[PDB]
């Protein structure tokens, strides 16, 4: 009867709940005000919207049923699939928005004229809409996977229902490997290379120019441009490696210490995953003074 429970401490529950609440209150306002403020502007707004949707959708249900001391699920078979579908859609949307914003900034800084030629305002709106639709399409597989199951040994216990994958482990493993490849590795490489080359362009700018604030502005620009990659990697690697550890490890390797450590690493990885939704407006203000002024006024 009790084989289906998780034994993380109640104090840990309250602490992680406090962290989640703080991140939620910061991020909701941070993204909402910047979205209201509003071709890099379209990409910035799309990224803010994706972060806001992530924080609004994943945070509450996860904190209630997933990130807690209680095992039993209460969203019904349809909800089991819906929660994960929205979470995956939001994750892909955030990653693709970051990659597209990096590409747009690359084009604007390095190749201005053709950037506007090929990335007109209507073209930009169509591109962001297509990115959102692609993110939604890539999250379809989670619908038929993350169902509900009466995992209790008796099969009819008071909390048998749990939101867990239903497919045979091989297909769950392969789909989550594809998720890691398409949501982290590809955006990671794109972001890293493009941000590094843009930072090198700004560094050669600084070297050639050598101004009171011009050098300072370029230095802070490159600092933030590489801190973007640092933050992306830090926030997103633990989550995907936790999913891969969940999928790949064999039954014989599992041990109670591993089980409890995994259910702690869940909280750690999800906190780091949510930190991304709140970091963005902070950097947006740190990078542009005019944007900071409009943000504060709004």
């Amino acid at each position: 009867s009790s084989e289906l429970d998780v034994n993380t401490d109640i104090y840990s529950k309250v602490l992680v709940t406090a962290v989640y609440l703080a991140l939620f209150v910061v991020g909701t306002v941070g993204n909402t005000v910047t979205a209201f403020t509003l071709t890099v502007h379209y990409h910035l707004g799309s990224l803010a919207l994706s972060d806001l949707l992530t924080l609004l959708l994943a945070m509450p249900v996860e904190l209630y049923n997933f990130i807690w001391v209680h095992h039993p699920w209460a969203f019904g078979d349809a909800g089991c699939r819906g929660y994960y579908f929205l979470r995956d859609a939001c994750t892909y949307a955030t990653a693709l928005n970051v990659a597209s914003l990096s590409v747009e900034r690359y084009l604007a800084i390095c190749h201005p004229f053709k950037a506007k030629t090929l990335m007109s305002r209507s073209r930009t709106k169509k591109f962001i809409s297509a990115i959102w639709l692609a993110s939604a399409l890539l999250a379809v597989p989670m619908l038929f996977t993350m169902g509900e199951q009466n995992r209790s040994a008796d099969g009819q216990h008071a909390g048998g229902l749990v939101c867990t994958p239903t497919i045979h482990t091989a297909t769950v493993k392969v789909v989550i490997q594809v998720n890691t490849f398409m949501s982290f590795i590809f955006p990671m490489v794109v972001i890293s290379v493009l941000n590094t080359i843009i930072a090198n362009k700004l560094t050669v700018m600084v070297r050639q120019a050598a101004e009171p604030g011009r050098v300072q502005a370029l230095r802070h620009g490159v600092r933030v441009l590489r801190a973007v990659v640092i933050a992306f990697v830090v926030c997103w690697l633990p989550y995907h490696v936790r999913r891969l550890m969940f999928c790949y490890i064999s039954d014989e390797q599992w041990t109670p210490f591993l089980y409890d450590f995994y259910h702690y690493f869940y909280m750690v990885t999800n906190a780091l995953f949510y930190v991304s939704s709140t970091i963005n407006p902070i950097l947006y203000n740190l990078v542009s003074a005019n944007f900071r002024h409009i943000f504060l006024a709004t």
């Binding site: 998780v6 995992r151 994958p165 969940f246 995994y262």
Partner: peptide, 6 residues
């Protein structure tokens, strides 16, 4: 035991 929360 095998964890079920993804």
């Amino acid at each position: 035991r095998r964890p079920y929360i993804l």
